[PDB]
Design a protein around this ligand. Structure first.
Ligand code: R5P
Ligand code: R5P
Ligand code: ZN
Ligand code: ZN
Ligand code: ZN
Ligand code: ZN
Lengths: 152, 152
């Protein structure tokens, strides 16, 4: 494990063959309300566009998944609710170790009044994408599929 | 966009603030057969473990998503089938531009006889994970949720 770079949100290392990008673990929050899912959008310079996503972020030091989940929901949408741990996944285990912890939010309450809050019915997000009008981050897609799988 | 590294499967660059890992687009194949989903496992040095995944890989030069999908299914499981484009997503648009194209495979036929082929019912993969016995890559999770959403 030889490091070629130690950055702000990632490190670039080598393990002989493998190029490994170490990355901080992250969280994602799935929230449904009156048939609409809470998506969000922000400019993403890494991809040149603003894909459809759900409240998410990096787990800060001394903070655990749940806590991180709570903070992200509040900082990105100004809402708080009852969170339940659903599952987790490695974004791309082929080169990075970024692991995302997904949560479900219920009984959302306005606790606060350029990260666009986008309430939208999962069915329409799915249609817009199939029509090529909008893109998906892993979180957005997982939010939609999860919904179609367990929240209808 | 200043490059700090140009590697084999990724490039590390800077856009003033942003640390950007350019990555080749990838494909993923969802296949169900007699209630079992076709998962796969391989050692992943980037994460130190072998998460539950579905046939996937990098799109080679001159190859399009579908073609890549076909090749991966065949090289990793020795099967071929009827593939349909489902949707796509950016693994982690926060730092990388890796985009994955997900396909569904049907009417799988053995076209060929350390990437472990793991046939397993999505319900059990889901239970094992909830029990903390197994991890998920984004592809594996998407495969499971997609199944629970549209293939039951
Ligand atoms: O998460 C997997 C990504 O596709 C990585 O880029 C990984 O290195 C790809 O490896 P492979 O082609 O063996 O699936
Ligand atoms: O795909 C998003 C990943 O979490 C990236 O690491 C991204 O840089 C995180 O940014 P933020 O905390 O603003 O969501
Ligand atoms: Zn954030
Ligand atoms: Zn931070
Ligand atoms: Zn491959
Ligand atoms: Zn290759």
């Amino acid at each position: 494990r030889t490091y070629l770079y130690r950055g702000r949100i990632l490190n670039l290392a080598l393990e002989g063959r493998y190029e490994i990008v170490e990355h901080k673990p992250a969280v994602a929050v799935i929230a449904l309300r009156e048939g609409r899912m809470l998506f969000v959008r922000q400019m993403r310079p890494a991809v040149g566009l603003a894909p459809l996503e759900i409240p998410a972020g990096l787990i800060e030091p001394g903070e655990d998944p749940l806590e991180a989940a709570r903070r992200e929901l509040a900082e990105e949408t100004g809402l708080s609710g009852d969170l339940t741990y659903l599952f987790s996944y490695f974004v791309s285990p082929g080169f990075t170790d970024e692991k995302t912890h997904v949560f479900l939010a219920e009984n959302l309450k306005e606790v606060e009044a350029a990260i666009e809050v986008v309430w939208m019915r999962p069915e329409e997000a799915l249609e817009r994408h199939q029509r090529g009008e909008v893109e998906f981050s892993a979180t957005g897609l997982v939010g939609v599929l999860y919904y179609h799988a367990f929240l209808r």
